[PDB]
Scaffold this active site. Structure first.
Site, PDB file in Angstrom:
ATOM      1  N   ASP D  33      56.703  35.820  39.766  1.00 17.12           N
ATOM      2  CA  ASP D  33      57.865  35.130  38.917  1.00 17.12           C
ATOM      3  C   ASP D  33      57.734  35.737  37.168  1.00 17.12           C
ATOM      4  O   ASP D  33      57.866  34.963  36.309  1.00 17.12           O
ATOM      5  CB  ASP D  33      57.575  33.606  38.796  1.00 17.12           C
ATOM      6  CG  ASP D  33      56.268  33.123  38.385  1.00 17.12           C
ATOM      7  OD1 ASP D  33      55.084  33.876  38.771  1.00 17.12           O
ATOM      8  OD2 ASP D  33      56.085  32.157  37.687  1.00 17.12           O
ATOM      9  N   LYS D 146      57.563  25.596  39.352  1.00 11.64           N
ATOM     10  CA  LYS D 146      56.324  25.922  38.574  1.00 11.64           C
ATOM     11  C   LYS D 146      56.571  25.451  37.118  1.00 11.64           C
ATOM     12  O   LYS D 146      57.579  25.837  36.504  1.00 11.64           O
ATOM     13  CB  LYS D 146      56.010  27.482  38.785  1.00 11.64           C
ATOM     14  CG  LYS D 146      54.723  27.852  37.842  1.00 11.64           C
ATOM     15  CD  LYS D 146      54.306  29.219  38.326  1.00 11.64           C
ATOM     16  CE  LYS D 146      53.732  30.076  37.441  1.00 11.64           C
ATOM     17  NZ  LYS D 146      53.106  31.104  38.231  1.00 11.64           N
ATOM     18  N   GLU D 187      50.634  22.766  37.140  1.00 15.10           N
ATOM     19  CA  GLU D 187      49.710  23.756  36.495  1.00 15.10           C
ATOM     20  C   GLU D 187      49.123  23.510  35.086  1.00 15.10           C
ATOM     21  O   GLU D 187      49.599  23.881  34.151  1.00 15.10           O
ATOM     22  CB  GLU D 187      50.545  25.244  36.535  1.00 15.10           C
ATOM     23  CG  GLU D 187      49.685  26.214  36.334  1.00 15.10           C
ATOM     24  CD  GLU D 187      50.547  27.521  36.427  1.00 15.10           C
ATOM     25  OE1 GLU D 187      51.335  27.654  36.619  1.00 15.10           O
ATOM     26  OE2 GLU D 187      50.048  28.494  36.027  1.00 15.10           O
ATOM     27  N   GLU D 189      46.492  25.086  33.257  1.00 10.13           N
ATOM     28  CA  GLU D 189      45.757  26.262  33.180  1.00 10.13           C
ATOM     29  C   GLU D 189      44.847  26.204  32.103  1.00 10.13           C
ATOM     30  O   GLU D 189      45.239  26.250  31.052  1.00 10.13           O
ATOM     31  CB  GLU D 189      46.583  27.280  33.154  1.00 10.13           C
ATOM     32  CG  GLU D 189      45.875  28.803  33.156  1.00 10.13           C
ATOM     33  CD  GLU D 189      46.715  30.102  33.348  1.00 10.13           C
ATOM     34  OE1 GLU D 189      48.020  29.946  33.305  1.00 10.13           O
ATOM     35  OE2 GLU D 189      46.223  31.068  32.978  1.00 10.13           O
ATOM     36  N   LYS D 229      48.181  23.469  40.569  1.00  8.45           N
ATOM     37  CA  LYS D 229      47.536  24.829  40.404  1.00  8.45           C
ATOM     38  C   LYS D 229      46.719  25.097  39.223  1.00  8.45           C
ATOM     39  O   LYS D 229      47.264  25.248  38.109  1.00  8.45           O
ATOM     40  CB  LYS D 229      49.105  25.787  40.276  1.00  8.45           C
ATOM     41  CG  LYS D 229      48.897  27.386  40.164  1.00  8.45           C
ATOM     42  CD  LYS D 229      50.183  27.819  40.334  1.00  8.45           C
ATOM     43  CE  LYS D 229      50.309  29.285  39.890  1.00  8.45           C
ATOM     44  NZ  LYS D 229      51.590  29.773  40.135  1.00  8.45           N
ATOM     45  N   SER D 300      47.769  30.918  44.697  1.00  9.74           N
ATOM     46  CA  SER D 300      48.930  31.237  44.185  1.00  9.74           C
ATOM     47  C   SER D 300      48.784  32.427  43.298  1.00  9.74           C
ATOM     48  O   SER D 300      48.381  32.111  41.843  1.00  9.74           O
ATOM     49  CB  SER D 300      49.656  29.945  43.359  1.00  9.74           C
ATOM     50  OG  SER D 300      50.857  30.499  42.950  1.00  9.74           O
ATOM     51  N   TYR D 352      31.670  46.597  25.136  1.00  3.81           N
ATOM     52  CA  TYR D 352      30.792  46.851  23.772  1.00  3.81           C
ATOM     53  C   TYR D 352      31.713  47.525  22.818  1.00  3.81           C
ATOM     54  O   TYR D 352      31.372  47.386  21.715  1.00  3.81           O
ATOM     55  CB  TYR D 352      29.494  47.676  24.397  1.00  3.81           C
ATOM     56  CG  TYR D 352      28.706  46.642  25.122  1.00  3.81           C
ATOM     57  CD1 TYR D 352      29.034  46.575  26.410  1.00  3.81           C
ATOM     58  CD2 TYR D 352      27.515  46.016  24.601  1.00  3.81           C
ATOM     59  CE1 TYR D 352      28.256  45.626  27.178  1.00  3.81           C
ATOM     60  CE2 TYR D 352      27.021  45.194  25.399  1.00  3.81           C
ATOM     61  CZ  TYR D 352      27.172  45.063  26.935  1.00  3.81           C
ATOM     62  OH  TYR D 352      26.500  44.122  27.684  1.00  3.81           O
TER      63      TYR D 352
END
Lengths: 349, 7, 349, 352, 352, 19, 19, 7
Positions: D33, D146, D187, D189, D229, D300, D352
Site C-alpha cells: 500500500d 488500514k 495501527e 506504530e 498492527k 503485515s 559511525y
C-alpha cells in the site's frame, strides 16, 4: 447527564457565606496547623522543650495577640490537638479565634504516602471516616478544612498519575466536607524545589489546576463553597535567573486566570520558601497586577506570619508582648498586601 | 518535616 | 510536565487583539454563515428563487446596511461561497465588512456525523486539510472561525462519549486555527429540544463546559485567543414551566462562572429557538445579572438579527431600505443588550 | 450505562468472519500500500522509471505469484490507485486477490499532522467523509482498512496528549469502518527510532496499548471485528545493547498479554526496520514464546516481503518468475513463522 | 513515558507464584470473611448464640474439614478477628489453612461510603494506613487481600463518576498490596439487583471492566500478581426473562474476553444470589464455553459453599461431621466446575 | 514521499544482510 | 450488619431449591 | 436543515 443535587440552596448559602467571611477584603489565614512533629522542630530551633504546655502557650501567644489583628485575620487553621486546647483564662482556642472575628479551620488530611512506580511522587491519605470526623469538627467549632497534596517539578514529574490521583483525592475530600457544612480548602502544593525557571512553574501550575477543576466538576463540587491554596508561580529554589516581583505576580495571575473558574470564592496563597517580607511583597504585587482578578487573592501563611514571633518569644514568658508585636506586624503587612496597599451464536452477544 | 518551615 | 510552546508572544498578541476587537464593548457578531441549503429554505419562506444572485443580493443587503450598525457589529461570520462574493460596486464582501469596522469570520466545520452506538448523537467533521484551509482563508481576509458541535438533552444524552468526543474535536480545531493566526470560536451547542427544565439545562451546560475547557487545556489552547459560543441556559422547548428573563440570566451566568476561565476573551451567545425580541431581552438580563462576569457577554445571532429583515425584503429590490432598517433595529437593540442598557524469568519483564 | 448497539448480530458476524479469514492459521498480510511517491523511490533504487505501467506491473508481479502463496496470504492491503488497476488479463486487482483466497484491504488515512505544543509529535487525519469512502471501497471489493498513527520514544515523548489523541482518532476511524462492513486494522506504530533500550519500549508499548483499548471501549468498538498492527517490542535502532530473539519475543508477548483483550482476533506485526530474514525469525520466536497467546500472532509486512522480489525484478519483464519466487520464499517463511514452525557480533560501519 | 518500576523481578515472582497457587487447576476460594454482625445473623438463622466461641467453632468447622477439601481450596479469605483465632489444638487458623495447602487471605476494605451528587451510588474506603496493615497481615500469614467495590444497574447508574472513582480506588488498593507482597483480588461487584436483562448486564460489565483495567494500567499494577472477583453476567433478579446456563456462560465469557488482559492470573466469581447448586452449574457452563479463556475461571464463594454446612451444624457440637460433609460436597462440586467437569418453568410465589 | 517501512531506521541485521 | 452475599436479592433457582 | 432558523 442527570442531576442528583449534592446540596440544597440552604447548604449552598451556608458554605458560600463561610467561604466569603474567611477571604473578606483585607483578611487572610493564619496557618497554625503544624503537626506535633513539625512544631517540636520549631521549639527546638529556639531551644525550647517540646511539651504540650509549650505548644499550647505558643499557640495562645498567636491566638491572643491584640485587636489590631482582627481586621487582618479571616481564618485560623488548627491541628487536631489545638482545636481541643484552652487559653490560660479557660476559653477554648476556637472561642478565642471566633471572638476576634476569625473563622476556625481544621487540618483533616493524614499526610502524604508514596505512589508506587513513580519517581518519588506522593498522594495524600485521610478519607477514612472523614465524614464522621467532619461532623464532629463542625460541632466542635470548625467551619473550614485543609487537605494538602504535594507535587514536584522534575525531569519526569509531576507525572500523569500524580496529577490525576492528587486531583481525584482533593475532589473526594472536598465532597465529604461539603456534606458536613465545612468549607474545603483545596491545596495542590507544587514544591519550589529544583532548578526550573518561572515559565516551567507557570506551565505545571496551569496543567495541575486544570486537572483540579475538572476533578471538582466530576465529583459535583460546589465551587462558591470552596477556596484554593496554591503556591505562587515562582522559579525553582536552585534557578539562577533573577525575576522581579511584578514578573512573579504576572506569571501567578495569568496561570490562575487560565484555569480557576470565577465561582471560586478566593485564592489563599502558600508562601513556599519565601521570607516573611518576600511573601508580603509578592502578595502585594499579585494584587497590583493590571489584569482582571475575579476572586480574592490573599494569604494562608504559617512561617510567613510566625518566624519573627517564634524567634522573639524564644520560650520566654517575659517575651510574650515582644513576640506578639512581631506577629501583629506581619498580620498588618499581609492585610495591606491582600489589598495591593503594602509598602515595606456468539454474535448475538 | 514541615515544607513551609524548612525551605 | 514539559512546555513546547505552541505560540510565540507575537502570535499570542495577534490572536488576543483579534478576539478583543470582535467582542469590544457594545459589539457582537452577525452570523450570516448559513449553508446554501439553509439559505435556500430562507428564500423559499419568502417566495424567492434560490439563485446564487438572490443569495448574493440578500447577503449584500445585510453587509451594506448603513453606518448605524458599525458600533454594533464586531464580527461577521460567512459561509465559504459568500467569502468570495462581491457587492454590486465590485467590492469583495470581506472588504465591505472590514470598511465598516467588522472582523471577517469563516465557518470551517464540515457538518455533523453520527456517533455509532449512541442514541442519535453526533460529532463534527472538518479537520482534514484544515491547516491549509485556515492559511488560505487568512490570506483571503478571514481572522476568526466557527466550528459547531451539537449536543442533545434526553434520557441517556449527552453521553460520556458525546461529551468527550465533541470537546476533543473542538480542541483539535482550535489548535489548528491558532497555528494560522485565526481566532477559533468554540461552539458546544446544547440543543433546547425536549421537555427538560432550567435546572437540567444548567447541569448539562456545566458538565459540557468543564469537559470543553479540560480538552482545551490538554491540547495547549491559548484561551485569550478564543471565544465561546454556547446556548443560553433555558428550559427545553417542550417544558411547561415558565421562567422570567432574570432566572434565565441567573442560570446562564452561574453556569459560565463555574466553568469558563477568566482568560477566555468573550462569550458570544446563540439564540436557539428565541424570537428577535426574546434574544435581546435575555442578553440584556445576562448583562444586568448581579454577579461578577469577567468576560464580554455578547451575541452571535443569525435569525435573531435577520428574521424581520428577510421578511421585509421579500425578494423585492424595492424593499432594500425597509429590510435594512429591520436589521439595523436588531443590531441597535443587541448592541444595547450586550451593555445591559436595552429597554424594548518472565518476571524480569 | 445504556446500550444503543452500534452493530446488529449480522454486522458482527460479517466483521468477525472477515477478521478471522485474514489471520487464519498460517496466514498473514502483504502490505503493498505504498503511495505513488514511495513506490517511485523503490523503482528508482532498481533503476526503473516511475511510470503508472511500471507501478501496475510491479503490483501485478506480487498479486499474481503462483498458488504456493495462497495458504500464506490472508490479506493484501492496497493504496487507492492499485485498487482500481487491472492485471494483464483485464481482471481488477481486488478480483485477482480474492481468486487466490485473499481478503482485499485499503489504506484510508490521509497522513500524519503536527500536534501544536508537543515536541514534534503527530496525530493522523482522514476522518472527513470516511463513511462514504468506506461504503464505496466495500462495493469496489475491499473488506478491511488500514489507518496509521505514529508515536515516538524520546525524552518527553510520547506525551499524554499524543497517546490520548492518537487512541481517540483510531477509535473514531474503527467506528466508521465497522458501520460500513470494513474490518479496521488498528495501527499504533511506536517507532524504533532512538537509543532507548528493550525495557523502555516494553513500558511505552504497554501504556500506548492500554490507552488504545480504553478508547476502543469508549467508542463501542467490536474487538472481534478488529486487528491490531503494532511494532514488535525491540530496543531502539541506535541502542547498542544486544538482545536475543527469545528476549524480543518475551518482551513483545508480555506487553500484548498485559494490554490486548483476548477478543481481539489477531495481531499483524510491522517489521520495524528489520531485515527480511530477521522479521521471520522474530515472528517465529514470538509464536514459540512459552506464554499463553490468545490471539493470532502474524505478519503485515511490506519491505520485509518485497525487498528481494523488487531487486530480482530490476524492471525487467524477463525476470518476472525469479522476482515472484523471492516473494513466495518470504511468504512461505512467514507462513511457517506465524505458526512457530520456521527454521532457516555484527557492527555496521555505517553507524559511525 | 518513563519507567520507575513499582516492583523488582523478585517481588513480581512472589506475587505471580501466590496468585497461581490460589487458582491452580481444580482450586477456588472459600470466602469465610463475614463481619461479626453478619456472622451473628448466620448464627441467629440456626438458633445459635452470637458468642466469640460459636464464631471461632464455626470457622474451625470449615477450616478443619477432611483432606478431600485440600485439592478444592486454593485460598481462604478471613475477616480480621478470625486471622488471630486458634483451632482446638492451639494452631493459629492461618497455619491450619496452610497445612491443607491453602493460601490465607484477608478482607482489608473499611466498607462502602456514599458518593454525593449520585443516585445512591458508593465508593469504598480503607486506604488510610493500608500499607502498615498489609505489612502486618503478611507477617501474620496472609498472602492475598480482598477489597469490595459496589456498582448498581439502574436508570442513571452506574454513573461516569461511580465507575471512574471505584476503578481508581481499586487501583490505589492494588498498588499498596503489591508493595507489601500481598496479591490484591480486585472486586468490582456489579449487583444483580433490579429488572435489567442479560444484554444490559453484559454491556455494564464490559464498561466497568474496561475502566478497571485502564485504572490498573495508570497505577502501574502488575496484572500477573492480581486476581479479578466479579459477578457472573446474569439478568437482574427481578427480570422475568429466563436464560439457559449456556447463555449466562456465553455472556460472561464474552464480557471477560472483551476486557480482561490475558496476563490476569485468574477470575474468582461471586455467586451473585444464586443457589449453592446453580452457582456450581453456572461456573461449569463457563468452563465448558467453546471460546478461548486465557485465565483460570473459578469460585470465590461464601454462602454458596457454606449455606448447607451452617444448617447441618445448627450450633450442635455432635453435628460437626455432618456439617463438614455438606461443605466438602460443595467444595468437590465447585472443584469439578472450575475444570468444566461437573455433572449433577419455575415461578416463586414470594416474587408476588 | 517518505515511507517509514522502506526509508526508516534499520536494525544491525538489515546492515549485516545487505553488506 | 448487612451482608450482600447472604442478605442480597436471590435468583429464582435459590427460591426453587429452598421451597 | 438549520437549527437557528428551523426552531
Amino acid at each position: 447527564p442527570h442531576s442528583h443535587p449534592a446540596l440544597t440552596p440552604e447548604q449552598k448559602k451556608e458554605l458560600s457565606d463561610i467561604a466569603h467571611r474567611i477571604v473578606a477584603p483585607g483578611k487572610g489565614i493564619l496557618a497554625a496547623d503544624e503537626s506535633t512533629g513539625s512544631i517540636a522542630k520549631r521549639l527546638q530551633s529556639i531551644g525550647t522543650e517540646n511539651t504540650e504546655e509549650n505548644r499550647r502557650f505558643y499557640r495562645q501567644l498567636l491566638l491572643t495577640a491584640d485587636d489590631r489583628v482582627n481586621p487582618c485575620i479571616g481564618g485560623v487553621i488548627l491541628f487536631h490537638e489545638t482545636l481541643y486546647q484552652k487559653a490560660d483564662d479557660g476559653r477554648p482556642f476556637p472561642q478565642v479565634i471566633k471572638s476576634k472575628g476569625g473563622v476556625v479551620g481544621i487540618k483533616v488530611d493524614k499526610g502524604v504516602v508514596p505512589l508506587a512506580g513513580t519517581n518519588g511522587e506522593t498522594t495524600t491519605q485521610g478519607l477514612d471516616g472523614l465524614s464522621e470526623r467532619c461532623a464532629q469538627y463542625k460541632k466542635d467549632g470548625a467551619d473550614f478544612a485543609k487537605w494538602r497534596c504535594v507535587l514536584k517539578i522534575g525531569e519526569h514529574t509531576p507525572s500523569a498519575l500524580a496529577i490525576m490521583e492528587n486531583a481525584n483525592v482533593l475532589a473526594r475530600y472536598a465532597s465529604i466536607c461539603q456534606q458536613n457544612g465545612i468549607v474545603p480548602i483545596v491545596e495542590p502544593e507544587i514544591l519550589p524545589d529544583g532548578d526550573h525557571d518561572l515559565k516551567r512553574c507557570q506551565y505545571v501550575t496551569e496543567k495541575v489546576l486544570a486537572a483540579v477543576y475538572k476533578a471538582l466538576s466530576d465529583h459535583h463540587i460546589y465551587l462558591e463553597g470552596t477556596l484554593l491554596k496554591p503556591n505562587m508561580v515562582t522559579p525553582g529554589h536552585a534557578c539562577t535567573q533573577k525575576y522581579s516581583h511584578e514578573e512573579i505576580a504576572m506569571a501567578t495571575v495569568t496561570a490562575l486566570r487560565r484555569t480557576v473558574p470565577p465561582a471560586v470564592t478566593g485564592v489563599t496563597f502558600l508562601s513556599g520558601g519565601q521570607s516573611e517580607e518576600e511573601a508580603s511583597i509578592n502578595l502585594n504585587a499579585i494584587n497590583k497586577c493590571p489584569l482582571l482578578k475575579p476572586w480574592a487573592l490573599t494569604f494562608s501563611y504559617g512561617r510567613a506570619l510566625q518566624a519573627s514571633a517564634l524567634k522573639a518569644w524564644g520560650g520566654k514568658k517575659e517575651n510574650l508582648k515582644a513576640a506578639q508585636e512581631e506577629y501583629v506586624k506581619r498580620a498588618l503587612a499581609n492585610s495591606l498586601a491582600c489589598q495591593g496597599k503594602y509598602t515595606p451464536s456468539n454474535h448475538a452477544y | 518535616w514541615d515544607e513551609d518551615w524548612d525551605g
